[PDB]
Design a protein around this ligand. Structure first.
Ligand SMILES: CCCCCCCCCCCCCCCC(=O)O
Ligand SMILES: CCCCCCCCCCCCCCCC(=O)O
Ligand SMILES: *C(=O)CCCCCCCCCCCCC
Ligand SMILES: *C(=O)CCCCCCCCCCCCC
Lengths: 254, 281, 239, 61, 254, 281, 61
């Protein structure tokens, strides 16, 4: 029985299946769990919505193309509109959570191509215009994929998204130090990374701080031949885990 | 269990919802193969995280007995008050399930059926219009006679056959409670057969189908009263209740309308009702 | 009084009902019981008694005579020759139909069990012969030849000092019960008789002689669904 | 020769009532309907498998 | 060892192999066996030819085509000419047997299509001409497949074989209540149903009564593309099991 | 306690008068605060010096069961003896408590109600005036059929629906005792609701009120007899008795007269009757 | 399986009579009306108080 290629993940009213996985990466060896009485600082009772928050949210999926350079999403911000997680994040000064990230991409024995799927903590990105500063709308489109550029330039306060430097002044080939998997179309149809709350402080504001960035970068370009299905998307579905919130007031932004 | 020993049951409730937690594993309860011929025994807790619910619901009325053991009309027959000369002074019915639409579809959901039966019969009378309809007509008694396959048919409203020296009969006066009998499992075979994909003759011929097996005999009806000056018409409704039931081989329920009481014929109908679009609200 | 609630069925007269009733003559001292030989307690006891069959059934002339009961045999008759044939419908086929077994059957709609036809040779004591007594089960049609008959359930009767040989017909049926009435579904097959060799005689002996056939029901026989017989009727009361 | 049995009542808020039966007739056919046997075995229809299909396992392997 | 996709069935001087099966359906949970002394009625000794009768008879195989509506065969009648089973059935008034039904159909990863394989007990079919009666030659061609029709009409005393009502006034999508499997060309190359003697009486005549009908109905049409092997047959091989016969006489029909 | 197990009671008598003596103290049993929402549990002995009385009175007839378990008329329906052509030859009633004034006010004193019910039905007949009213009309049998929410409505006095292969029916001959049935707690919810301050649609719309919840199905009525030369009219009175009762949330009894059987509408009435002066004898 | 119970009689001058019950039907719905349960609890309506209000004491203090 039990082929290790087959997997079923259930969280809240959500189940994802896969019949071609390559194990699952638990970020830095640590499974997500709630903030403990020793490590706590905000004295108020936390609200823990469990199944209502901690469930599988499918974000707007992107199309993989032969020349398409790459994509990033920012968490928790990508989830700012995803159901009751978004609401809780909107009505609370502080929030804390880990996440099951599940990237999906299927093609065929006859297709080829390989993408890096990585969760980078504190991926603080550089301004394209080195002289100037970057700004939110060029840092995150919430649940919509921000694209990496093959082109070394961009519009006013856009990030320097030139792929080989991963938007942050380093070698993209070294991104592998962060919790990652690869969807190599020969081998698998999905990636799964279970990311713990990685931060220097027990809870933080859900909007101000992008705790980590999901980067999907094609290291080997998507390819196939003579009339063999052009459209092949990449879908990212993510589930919050052990989510708890402190400091409640009115609807929040400013 | 003994379907004839009524006062001896078995209480079987529905299944409870066991609480499920989150999972991340190699076991796949909702990934399977229809090709197998197997139905998925999945429970909501294999796909969602469920709470703990105690289902004290019982599958009571869907029991074959509770489903079939409600007394249905199978046929009604008509006859006037008259003399030997009047053909219409008496009547008969060859016993059959397939005459009506409703009970027939219920029984036919099972290939083979074995049961005892409660027969109730509502005989109703009415005055014929006539110059003499003014008439003091006394209380009418009625005779229902079962003639099993082989016995003498009554040729008139008034012949030796109605003596019933061995045939079962019921004599019933009007105004009283409806006549009622119980019948054993009357068949020569180990179960009644609602369907027979076969022939009456060894040479693959003669009568095709269920007709061949279901030879139940017939019910003869008459008035026992001599005729009053103006005629009175009576109509007998025969009611059947399958009790002490056992059923074998479930079938799809009849989609097409019934055409003949003799055979299983149909003319082709659509699989379901049509809708506006494949995406519907 | 005690709250009774009358159900359907109330006040009907069912011919087959089994209820207690008041006696019109209370404390009647009935005539004391005596022995009387020959007590029948079940009609099958009668069906189990041997009757003689009207197999010589050819014409009204012989049917209103003793000829009906005697089947004519003859010397120098060629080997595979058929003596008689008919399908086994006890209580329906004229050959067995109005015998003791047949008559009992006719007050019922369903029968079951094995039948035994006892063949008795009433020819000259000085005469000899061998016969094939056959029973073909249904599905194939009546055995047209001694070879066809041979293939089915059979006895080869050698006539001699034991006058009579019995052809025991087995209950071989799809169903546990057949109809008394002739029905295509409850068909019971064909019983036929053939010269296995021939009837041989000495010099001043008669050439034609006779066999006769008794029929009765074996210990596995039974009948169901009680009904009136077609065998008796009237237009008016008798006086 | 009376039979005592249990009546269909219903799930009570966090019971047993009885009824009496006497068979009046000599023929079991005459008896009340067997309405209280809630027994079932969908297995023969839902799972007619020679090899037992374990839910948590893949159907084919 | 032992992949559950692989199967070997041996009966008499016959072995069928398959390397892509989907388990095997034992009709109504019951494996075939001989008529017992309690349930018996015909008093004569049964002949039980064992290996001579109970073996794998391959019937005339049919071709599956994209638009081909479906097929049926009737048992035991389809076997009326199959070796010594046929002979025993011919010389005996009564016969009884269960059967291992094995439908075969192979195609390729690149082909698609799905057929229902079902054993319907007492499948009493309706006359196309509702007014009239049907007749044997339009009910069964022995070992040759009788076809289902897409067309709502047929020649004198032909069955109403219009597929969506399965030749018997019901929804074809509900035929699944009877012992069945599916050969979905993606998944498997064969189906196997072990049918017990299902009938209201211990033994019956082998000709008069068609105890059950094998229906093979394509729910998803056969398809493939540009020059990829047109011919793809469906072969039905069946083996009688626990066969016994009562009431012996001459060669039988009438 | 088990409301279905009738022969199992509880005898609870009224409270006795304990003897009081004179007092002069700091305790004040009759000085309290209505604002609290509390009712004063004062006894006459807290205000007067009382004697000792033994009250063997019991609150018998004010039990919810003794109060509701008296068989009331909820509706009556009418139908003539006729042919398929005659619309008036049969009739129906959508089952409802709110049709009559008297039982409705009794039930509505409680918000939620759970009970079994005894239905008795008095069917009465009368001769229509006609040249033929002279006519020997035989005893009329009647059919009452319950069609649960979803089944086939009878379109005529004479259609397949009246077969009742699965619907409950009562056949009743005239002159006999009135037809009677018992009904279980038929609802899909844990108690019947006499009031629903809510909507049939999630969008705060569609049907307002109790109507939304109380979908009980309907009773179809007909004569089983063929028509006599002169017509005969029958009228069926449906009687309800709530037995094995449980009740929740008491309400003020209806002050205003009922207007619609469909909704809770009223037009405003005075709180009480007026009197001559605030000082009255 | 008969049930014996007590009849409603009345306060006698300074008693117990019985009646018999046999349930005839298979369904508890068919049973007689539960008329003899004189149980009550006005408390929920007359006194729905979180803090217990002692009669001899002042309601407010
Ligand atoms: C007055 C006496 C009346 C006796 C009536 C005997 C009636 C026999 C009833 C046979 C019911 C057969 C049900 C067959 C069911 C089926 O296979 O469709
Ligand atoms: C001939 C069979 C008749 C069966 C009749 C079934 C009648 C169902 C009765 C439902 C009563 C519902 C009472 C609702 C009370 C309320 O909420 O106002
Ligand atoms: C067992 O049957 C004896 C228990 C007491 C029987 C009381 C009988 C009730 C009245 C007689 C019914 C007789 C039916 C023929
Ligand atoms: C317990 O029930 C046995 C006590 C004696 C029973 C006498 C029964 C009275 C007559 C039968 C009533 C049967 C109702 C179906």
């Amino acid at each position: 029985g039990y082929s290790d290629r087959v997997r079923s993940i259930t969280l809240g009213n959500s189940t994802i299946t896969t019949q071609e996985c390559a194990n699952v990466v638990v970020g830095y060896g640590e499974w997500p769990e709630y903030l403990s009485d020793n490590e706590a600082t905000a004295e108020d009772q936390p609200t823990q919505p469990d199944v209502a928050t901690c469930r599988f949210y499918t974000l707007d999926s992107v199309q993989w193309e032969n020349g398409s350079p790459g994509w990033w999403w920012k968490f928790p911000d990508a989830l700012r509109d995803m159901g009751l997680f978004g609401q809780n994040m909107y009505y609370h000064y502080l929030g804390r959570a880990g996440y099951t990230i599940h990237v999906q991409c299927n093609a065929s024995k006859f297709h080829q191509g390989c993408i890096l799927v990585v969760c980078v903590p504190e991926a603080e990105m550089g301004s394209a215009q080195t002289s100037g500063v970057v700004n939110y709308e060029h840092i995150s489109k919430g649940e919509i994929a921000s694209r990496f550029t093959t082109t070394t330039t961009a519009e006013d306060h856009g990030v320097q998204a030139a792929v080989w430097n991963a938007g942050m002044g380093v070698g993209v080939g070294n991104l592998t130090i962060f919790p990652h998997q690869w969807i190599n179309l020969r081998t698998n149809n999905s990636a799964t990374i279970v990311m713990p709350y990685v931060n220097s402080v027990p809870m933080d504001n859900m909007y101000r701080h992008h705790n980590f960035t999901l980067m999907i970068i094609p290291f080997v370009p998507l390819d196939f031949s003579a009339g063999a299905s052009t459209y092949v998307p990449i879908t990212v579905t993510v589930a919050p885990m052990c989510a708890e919130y402190n400091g409640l007031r009115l609807a929040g932004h400013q | 269990g003994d379907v004839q020993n009524a006062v001896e049951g078995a209480m079987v409730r529905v299944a409870d919802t066991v609480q499920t937690s989150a999972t991340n594993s190699e076991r796949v309860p909702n990934l399977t193969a229809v090709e197998t011929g197997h139905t998925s025994q999945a429970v909501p807790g294999d796909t969602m995280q469920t709470r703990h619910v105690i289902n004290n619901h019982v599958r009571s009325e869907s029991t074959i007995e509770n489903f079939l053991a409600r007394s249905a009309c199978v046929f009604y027959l008509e006859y006037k008050t008259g003399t030997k000369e009047d053909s219409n002074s008496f009547n008969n019915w060859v016993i059959t399930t397939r005459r009506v639409a409703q009970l027939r579809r219920k029984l036919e959901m099972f290939t083979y059926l074995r049961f005892d039966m409660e027969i109730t019969v509502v005989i109703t009378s009415s005055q014929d219009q006539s110059t003499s309809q003014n008439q003091n007509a006394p209380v009418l008694t009625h005779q229902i006679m079962y003639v099993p396959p082989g016995g003498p048919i009554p040729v008139s409203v008034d012949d030796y056959s109605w003596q019933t020296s061995t045939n079962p009969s019921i004599f019933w006066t009007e105004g009283n409670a409806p006549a009622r009998m119980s019948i054993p499992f009357i068949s020569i075979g180990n179960a009644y057969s609602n369907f027979y994909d076969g022939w009456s003759h060894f040479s693959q011929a003669g009568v095709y189908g269920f007709t061949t097996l279901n030879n139940m005999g017939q019910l003869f009806f008459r008035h026992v009263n001599k005729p009053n000056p103006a005629a009175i018409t009576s109509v007998a409704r025969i009611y059947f209740k399958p009790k002490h039931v056992r059923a074998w081989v479930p079938r799809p329920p009849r989609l097409c309308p019934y055409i003949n009481s003799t055979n299983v014929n149909f003319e082709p109908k659509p699989v379901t009702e049509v809708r506006t679009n494949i995406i519907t609200t | 009084g005690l709250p009774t609630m009358n159900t359907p069925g109330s006040n009907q007269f069912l011919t087959s009902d089994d209820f207690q009733s008041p006696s019109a003559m209370p404390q009647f001292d009935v005539t004391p019981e005596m022995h009387i030989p020959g007590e029948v307690r079940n009609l099958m006891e009668i069906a189990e008694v041997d009757s003689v069959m009207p197999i010589n059934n050819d014409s009204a002339a012989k049917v209103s005579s003793m000829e009906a009961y005697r089947v004519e045999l003859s010397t120098n008759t060629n080997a595979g020759t058929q003596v008689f044939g008919f399908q086994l419908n006890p209580g329906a086929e004229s050959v067995m139909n109005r015998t003791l077994m047949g008559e009992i059957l006719n007050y019922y709609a369903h029968w079951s069990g094995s039948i035994k036809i006892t063949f008795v040779f009433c020819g000259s004591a000085m005469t000899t012969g061998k016969f094939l007594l056959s029973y073909a089960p249904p599905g194939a049609g009546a055995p047209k030849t001694r070879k066809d008959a041979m293939l089915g359930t059979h006895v080869v009767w050698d006539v001699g000092l034991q006058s009579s040989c019995v052809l025991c017909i087995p209950w071989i049926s799809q169903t546990h019960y057949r109809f008394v009435e002739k029905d295509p579904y409850t068909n019971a097959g064909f019983v036929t008789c053939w010269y296995q060799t021939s009837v041989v005689s000495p010099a001043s002996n008669q050439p034609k002689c006779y066999m006769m056939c008794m029929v009765s029901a074996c210990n596995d026989f039974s009948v169901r669904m009680l009904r009136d017989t077609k065998f008796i009727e009237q237009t008016s009361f008798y006086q | 020769g009376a039979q005592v049995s249990t009546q269909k009542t219903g799930a009570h808020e966090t019971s047993i009532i009885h009824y009496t039966n006497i068979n009046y007739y000599k023929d079991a056919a005459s008896n009340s309907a067997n309405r209280q046997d809630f027994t079932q075995d969908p297995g023969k229809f839902t799972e007619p498998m020679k090899d037992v299909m374990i839910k948590t396992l893949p159907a084919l392997n």
